Structure 1
């Protein structure tokens, strides 16, 4: 028994989208904030973020831009796009539909048992 590999990836995706929903961010800052928000229990691998962010950018869910150039830097920031905001709405609504189906399955089982 274990959390399957696909579900771990889905959980990381979900967390990252919510981080960017809070505000634009960079990879090292995201990792640090998630570690703090998990009381040290969730230490995201930067390689994992690079893989996920490549996919999300391909799908138009996030975009990127350079920051810190005025200070002599060149750091990649990520932001949730309007398409990304809609994707998060659709994810919430579609999982709500799934929950409703499962609620009806349970209710239909009680009805028949009676």
Structure 2
């Protein structure tokens, strides 16, 4: 599959992950691994590049987690704008799916 497609897929997964709850890079990787039965292993560097893109664009913000169990983890959260970007992405992709269904029916 093209790199552009894989990247678009990662962008959609990450918006969904943060919509569901603040999360940190190695929690995201680990959880996407299980949700994919080990099929998808995201790379740290991909996540940082995307997270710089989203953070500059105001879609995510970051804060430090509880260090009580050891380790200061940087968490990421969807901002309120980022929730709207989430809805928009979700809705437009849903429309893409109907378009494709309808194109089958058109002929």
TM-score, normalised with respect to structure 2: 0.84
- Find the aligned partners of 1:98 and 1:86 in 2 and give their Cα distance: 18
> Judging changes above 3 Å, is the alpha-carbon distance between structure 1 residues 35 and 99 closer, same or farther for their aligned structure 2 residues?
closer
- Find the aligned partners of 1:57 and 1:106 in 2 and give their Cα distance: 39
| Structure 2: 5+ residue stretches without partners | none
Q: 1:45-83 CA distances to partner (integer Å, 9 max, x unpaired)?
A: 111101111101111111100112456642200011111
The match for 1:112 is: none
The match for 1:80 is: 78
The RMSD of aligned alpha carbons is 2.0
TM-score, normalised with respect to structure 1: 0.79
**Bigger relative contact order (CA 8 A; separation at least 6):** 2
Following superposition, the deviation at residue 4 of structure 1 comes to: 1.1
- Find the aligned partners of 2:56 and 2:50 in 1 and give their Cα distance: 10
> Judging changes above 3 Å, is the alpha-carbon distance between structure 1 residues 75 and 96 closer, same or farther for their aligned structure 2 residues?
closer
Is the CA contact 2:19–2:86 (under 8 Å) kept in the aligned structure 1? no
- Find the aligned partners of 1:91 and 1:102 in 2 and give their Cα distance: 17
